[PDB]
Symmetry: C3
Subunit: 137 residues, 3 copies
Amino acid sequence: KHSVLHLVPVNITSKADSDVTEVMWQPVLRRGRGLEAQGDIVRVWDTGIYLLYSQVLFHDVTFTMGQVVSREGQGRRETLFRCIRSMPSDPDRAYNSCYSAGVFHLHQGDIITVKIPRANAKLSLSPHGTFLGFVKL
Amino acid sequence: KHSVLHLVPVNITSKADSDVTEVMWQPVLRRGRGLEAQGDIVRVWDTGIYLLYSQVLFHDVTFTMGQVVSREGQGRRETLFRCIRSAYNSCYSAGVFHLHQGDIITVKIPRANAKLSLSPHGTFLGFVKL
Amino acid sequence: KHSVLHLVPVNITSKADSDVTEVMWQPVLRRGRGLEAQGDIVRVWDTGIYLLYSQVLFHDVTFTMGQVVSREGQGRRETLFRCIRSMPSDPDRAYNSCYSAGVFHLHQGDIITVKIPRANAKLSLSPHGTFLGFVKL
């Protein structure tokens, strides 16, 4: 039976003079031990091929938002995929979700990140609006 | 072999909405018998972990729309995932969830008389047991 | 171990009087031989049930936009799924990734196309923004 992990937000973080916002994740479903949430990143322990999906629900008013999913490993940062979505100007209509997913080879030791490249991004903590998960294939 | 069900619309529903618009679903691809379409709902007969995806293609032009995918089991109703958006506009989302025998799955658009497309390649619903 | 294919864009074909734009793909992740990328289309050699996903990032503004994923097989073309957005009013608010995916029975001898139904559509060739993939289930 395949290893899987579905994660939802506990809170959002944004370092001082960075222009980055990330999510502190918590597991709500887990089978197997190939994956482990460790705060705002997810560590891979079992080398192999994984379906990886990300949704973020944005409430920002700025031109465009979108999250970047990348894998740190082997001295590199590699971008796996990115979701881009344009935002309305009207602020009471800023409720837009961005879903992307793909299949990628991950090695044990790799760190997976989900970054939104603005500071203090207005991201929903709602577990059904913003989430992240994994299925070993 | 993984159990699967891929479903496409046959119709929408009734005037007075209770603030919701729904879809009658027709299976066009199946493997295994642990999932069953019962009109506007899908029943889960085999407890397990499932990929569940949903797309809805809107013709409408209002506030926000999007769809709410939920499960109701022994006692309690629970939102699994949602797609939100602000003349043709598709809204896709998906996730992996633990579904229980006896579960009713619903896909509800939370507005009255939403104009939804019945194109089987614009609005659809699916399950893969993992 | 399930067969898989993650593909990224090498180029865009678009015939002078055809109203359509296609993507030439190349695999960056491959397991098994049941699928074969070929010019602007993917051939299916191993009959089965497949998860298929597609994202396109559009450079275009002022165009109602999205992609069509289809198969040709036993005599006739068939639309599997599409993604669609209205991407008009404001040109500074145009960028949107369009993602869709589904599970489909593919037959040996099937060609899989991703098409944008407009002449000379401007797409990002970015492998993080535009991609196609397959997982046999």
